[PDB]
Design a protein around this ligand. Structure first.
Ligand SMILES: Nc1ncnc2c1ncn2[C@@H]1O[C@H](COP(=O)(O)OP(=O)(O)NP(=O)(O)O)[C@@H](O)[C@H]1O
Ligand SMILES: Nc1ncnc2c1ncn2[C@@H]1O[C@H](COP(=O)(O)OP(=O)(O)NP(=O)(O)O)[C@@H](O)[C@H]1O
Ligand SMILES: Nc1ncnc2c1ncn2[C@@H]1O[C@H](COP(=O)(O)OP(=O)(O)NP(=O)(O)O)[C@@H](O)[C@H]1O
Ligand SMILES: [Mg+2]
Ligand SMILES: [Mg+2]
Ligand SMILES: [Mg+2]
Lengths: 447, 440, 447, 440
DNA sequence: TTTTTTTTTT
């Protein structure tokens, strides 16, 4: 058969090197002359490397002279072939991608050649035992993996991790500057464990229905918007934006939401709401999309659109994940949830922004005597625990027990925190204003 | 005939995508791969989408390589075809218009195909009745409408929401509704917490059997009909309309239901019932559908019919959700529950009408020592808690405990209330009259 | 293609109208002249409508004269064609079904024509937008539905229900009753609360094993048979019919069942049994089927057969519901029970007959200290509670407690009564005679 | 090409099975029906297996009758072919060697087929990445190696048990190991009782994560590394590399972890950290490879991979053993933990490494009245009470009791210990630096 | 996912 190769990518790389010499470093880091399929291409890249190591700039005339001095001008195709290669390449903007393609082709060809050698050894043992052939095959595959050892790698070795250790110590010397390392949550206790909303983090705040989960998420959004100027993006899939705005005005102005909903408001609270609206129009960093049944592709497109138009996005609010709908994986809810979580994590890593993705719980919580939520108590759990890093659960024993002494005290229990120890953050909930504040009472030592 | 297509617009879109990658978002929002008439164009757009999702820029060489890796380079026409497509397109200034034309052609061809399928079903009944074919055609046309309704989406600025909110607040402040924002329940305490039956709300009042749940729902219906002129629509799937009317007459005239059911009534109560009938004929806003095993689509069609004919609908009553039948998801009951709840919520949002749908409970409530209902006590809740916003539960400790001091006292406990606090409303129940009144 | 039409049905309708004029109203309500496929048939029906509106009877000669006066006799086919149409039709008994068929064909042809119009509009946009075409298609399909909406509808009016209710009230008030409006139970206290066995009611009397459950059901059956002449239908799923008849003779003649079982009976009780058999042969209204593992479809077919043969059914006795077998829902018992209960309630509403179906209880009742049955004690509860209306439970503290003073006293406690207050009716049970009788002892005040 | 096969050896094996039924066990252990090159030979061996499992002796006539009953007599070549096969074989003395040759041929053909599959995957990527192809090839070679396994169980003879027992007695008596026998644990009480970190052992410490258990395993890793240069491996599923590094620096340098995490600039702690990392660089055997969500078979494969890389594993640190949750067994964790423990013991015996795991217990450790880790506090008891060879339980009464009865005498209670006296091992812990010391 | 009903055991 024909070995898998991309001659066009090689020609594009050679033309870009003939035009641009600053991107030679990326090519040298990525590929070598052996990655070139044709032996003339290997000779051309070898001459280019020799000229660049000598400090000579990479152009057509000097390369032609260098090939003529070594006599390789006729071996590579002549000066007309080099001129054609220089002519064909428009630009070297995507020469890194071309080099990646060439490296992939070289890896596949090396794998095919190794497979041919292994099959030849299998057909003709030549006195080698089965264990000998197995070890030879393992060594060959490990050598193929070792060819990209600096590319495919994970945690580092002792010396390199010690250099990373001293570098991180020098970095964390600068850490006591504000205490909050990410987006400020507005809560002192929350900014101690989590140290604020870290970028590229999946924040899963899950609670029972009518537990203030949307309310606390809105409070977090308000605190972030007052503590930053980067625009936020809200996807209120469950509730309309009218109720969201009513909750925001009740929380910020500390006025009863019932009176706002009935509209029976005095002029003093009206002036407070007007001042809050003036502050919001000063900010104008909030964008709410109340459409329901949206795919993660649409959300990603809108997020990229806003980031392009408004210069990045401060916060992404999602109104609970089981409302999100994918037509492709609508057959199975768990597959749909896993796909949604994976796409949202990819988007969060893409734009480097903490995404507020709420979630619901299961009915096994009420079955348990202790109604403190766990990771397995999550509605369609599993992949959610895998993809997320900042999972939290709202607990209100006042709701479950009428005689509970934790009235107003809402406990945010961290289920998963990859970077930092988990814990229980107590907060003071005001149902009238729907306001979550820092718990100013006596601190409880978690047993 | 030749299907209506604009291949030149497709070529212009593909060439503009090859030239410009910044307007890729507009093309992705407008059209998909299936909108392309020719299958090679579908493959080309699929490869472009795969490359752009990976972050790779859209150029000729990378696209050709990507098609070569999957072996689809020869399927789409070869690299020369791609080079020709890149050469032909001058610019991508009007690529949005070309994509709109392509989407229009695709939707028109979809409509033509649906019409052909409808004609085929008409010529070949395959044992289906005319109603089945009509409902299938309605479903197909609704699907085509949903395919076009996705354009009206997009995040909005905070200022517009603020203006709408303050306008609504001023409207509520000017109107002296005296707390009751929605449809008046007829109960003062219920008009304090819920502030009346708000439009586009899914009200789930679930209770145990023989708890007056249907009776209390009928009392709510009577109160709404007396306190409004907008016509109501009743779907009495479980109980016959005759029993519903007897319960209504017993409740409104405050006469014993047993005496009315036996017919042993004096002429004074007869005159009271006659006056009640005169008031009802003065209103004539009540329409009861005692049919059972109904799909939500039939309910939606009848609701739209009555709303257009009678100028909107004040209230939509459902006689307990597990009686409803969906043949599509009849294999699993929870799928039926989720579909019914979603369809009812969508219908309530559509016609802006409060819908009161009853439900049943589970035996786990009986297992608990305290028999106060919770959200998990719902009979296959699932998305019931998520979609609904005005869930209430009826509690009568007099039934469970003979020595209970809550005789006549019915506790309507709000399981879920998104806007406002939840609580327990005490009411006075008259078994003889089957009358729910405010507790004193 | 050929449009879907039934010329034979049209010819049958025309011949029936030529023969029968009393069923013209059904045809006019069902179909119009436009529903006829062929234009001559439209002309014929138009002429028939014109003659009937004028009051002229619909016969061959007058119709021929009317067509001759308008000159349409040649257009419809001639007098010989009309004579052939009159000849071919045997009878007009099924002319309503024929008109329904013609209406169906007309609706299908209308749908096909509308689909053709929509396809033509799709092929030629004529400058219309896709929204315009969608609205036009919706309008056309809704016009088809509205043409099909000119029939019996679900929500009719409140006035019709009011008239039916007041007619029922007048019917019940003009008849002097003894507090019984349904089938008389034969027990005075039961006739106070339940007011007799009401038709279209699912009566569930459930108890423990033994406990005289089938015995009490048979006592109710005997009382109903003695107090009415409408035939009753028993499905003795559990017990053989021989033992059923032995228990019936023991209860009715007040003789010990054990002596009848042994056959050692005196001539006086023999004469009493002979007189009871003479009374039964005077009645001859009870029809018993002892077949087991029956589907509800077979039961419904047999019930319809008996009602057609013997002019309705007075009462339907079902001997214990878990004996009923459905092959389709044999996988899950609860689904099978729900389907059986739904089918039985549909049958009871269909024929307007009281159906007393027996059932069993759960062992959790024995787990409780107080062994008074509740709704949840029902075996495979839920749908049983929902579909039924007259649920009762048998309680015998004499069985549970040897020192109980309720010996002979059986408490029938109403668990569910949709219309009326529930209670506890105590009866006198005779184990020797196996006879349930009205309470001759002190009636205890229920708390 | 012609696949490498030895039909003559197959004929010899089949004829020997026809002659001798006593050596059927050797052939059944060695080869299967799939190892036969020709499908008729596979059918013949399948019929032989079916006859011998039924207890019927394997002869020509019964085999032919069974093949005729299944209709396979004509497919394999007829009765004359079977008679020829029986005639050809002289004896069954060397049938073991012939079966070994047949197994070798089958394994070589399997390797050739796998190589052909890999070459096909290389020629046709089908959208898969090169990493996917490499992982698939490694999986295929590992499957070949796993299929190249042999007998693992068997009732041992009394002589072998006596030899092992007397060897154990001589080890306990004659050897003057003076406490430590394997890798030095560091804790003096663990040095005496557990006799060091014995290679090919299963040491599972059952406690709460970030509650002294993580720093206990960290101190174990440190003490093991300070006395040997054998490459140790890190598999922490609880904390990242940076946080584990901070914990290790705080433990070794005796510096408060608040200063380690929150930067308190001073040169004394910096000098202690510099000395600690100098000692670590002197050891030069800490290879970080911590991840999450794995299985012990994957851990064994990575152990083989590291042995290919360097060779020899000093210690593997499994932090948060309850982070490998399989959703099938996530609810009842006992069976999953038992299977993980058995596979970890198999891995420990495989590469001679003292596999140490950090099992997570329940919240009842802080809730139950019995604050010590007993079956209620253990995760559904079961695999935490048994199975594991060294099940240590960290009764840190500091966390469980606010007024602790164990401050510096926190009990490392050993439920089961193969070598050493069980009991409550009271040890000192420094909460400031997260450092576990050794109480006398 | 949901939802019933049985034993065992802690
Ligand atoms: N005016 C008010 N007075 C008192 N409590 C109120 C008022 N308005 C709202 N609440 C409470 O605030 C909470 C509303 O929380 P909310 O965030 O809307 O629930 P939710 O988490 O979004 N529901 P879900 O999405 O199904 O989980 C409830 O506990 C209400 O009782
Ligand atoms: N005339 C009457 N006298 C006394 N009590 C009565 C009378 N009529 C009805 N009741 C009681 O009032 C309640 C009415 O029951 P009902 O309205 O059917 O509740 P329900 O929820 O609709 N039953 P279900 O459909 O199974 O859930 C029951 O508790 C009856 O026992
Ligand atoms: N001669 C007798 N003397 C006393 N008790 C008797 C006599 N004959 C029958 N019984 C009682 O009659 C009862 C049987 O009633 P029956 O109605 O058949 O129960 P059942 O319906 O068969 N229960 P089940 O089998 O679960 O459906 C038992 O309690 C017997 O003790
Ligand atoms: Mg919410
Ligand atoms: Mg009801
Ligand atoms: Mg019985």
């Amino acid at each position: 058969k024909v070995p898998p190769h991309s001659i066009e990518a090689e020609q594009s790389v050679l033309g870009g090197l003939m035009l641009d010499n600053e991107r030679w470093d990326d090519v040298a880091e990525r590929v070598v002359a052996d990655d070139f399929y044709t032996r003339p291409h290997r000779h051309i890249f070898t001459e280019m490397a020799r000229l660049q190591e000598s400090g000579s700039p990479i152009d057509l005339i000097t390369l032609a002279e260098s090939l003529e001095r070594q006599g390789q001008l006729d071996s590579v195709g002549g000066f007309a072939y080099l001129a054609e290669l220089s002519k064909n390449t428009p630009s070297a903007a995507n020469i890194s991608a071309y080099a990646d393609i060439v490296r992939e082709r070289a890896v596949v060809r090396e794998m095919i050649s190794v497979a041919n050698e292994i099959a030849e050894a299998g057909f003709d043992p030549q006195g080698r035992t089965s264990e000998d052939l197995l070890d030879l095959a393992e060594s060959r595959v490990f050598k193929i993996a070792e060819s990209r050892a600096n590319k495919d790698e994970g945690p580092k070795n002792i010396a390199d991790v010690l250099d990373a250790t001293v570098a991180r110590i020098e970095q964390l010397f600068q850490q006591p500057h504000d205490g909050v390392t990410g987006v400020n949550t507005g809560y002192d206790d929350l900014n101690k464990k989590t140290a604020g909303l870290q970028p590229s983090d999946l924040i899963i705040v899950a609670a029972r229905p009518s537990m203030g989960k949307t309310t606390f998420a809105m409070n977090l959004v308000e605190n972030a918007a007052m503590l930053q100027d980067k625009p936020v993006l809200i996807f209120s899939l469950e509730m309309p934006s009218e109720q969201i705005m009513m909750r925001s005005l009740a929380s910020l102005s500390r006025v009863d939401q019932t009176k706002i909903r009935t509209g029976q408001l005095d002029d003093e609270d009206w002036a407070r709401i007007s001042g809050t609206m003036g502050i919001l129009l000063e900010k104008r960093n909030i964008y709410i999309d109340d459409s329901s049944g949206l795919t993660p592709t649409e959300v990603r497109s809108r997020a990229r659109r806003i980031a392009r138009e408004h210069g990045g996005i401060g916060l992404i609010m999602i109104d609970y994940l089981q409302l999100m709908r994918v037509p492709a994986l609508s057959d199975n809810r768990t597959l749909e949830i896993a796909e949604i979580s994976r796409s949202l994590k990819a988007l969060a890593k893409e734009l480097n922004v903490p995404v507020v993705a709420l979630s619901q719980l299961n009915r096994s919580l009420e079955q348990r005597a202790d109604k403190r939520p766990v990771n397995s108590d999550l509605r369609e759990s599993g992949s959610i625990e895998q993809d997320a890093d900042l999972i939290m659960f709202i607990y209100r024993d006042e709701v479950y027990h009428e005689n509970s002494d934790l009235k107003g005290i809402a406990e945010i229990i961290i289920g998963k925190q990859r970077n930092g120890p988990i814990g229980t953050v107590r907060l003071t909930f005001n149902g009238q204003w729907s306001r979550f504040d820092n718990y100013a009472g006596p601190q409880y030592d978690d047993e």
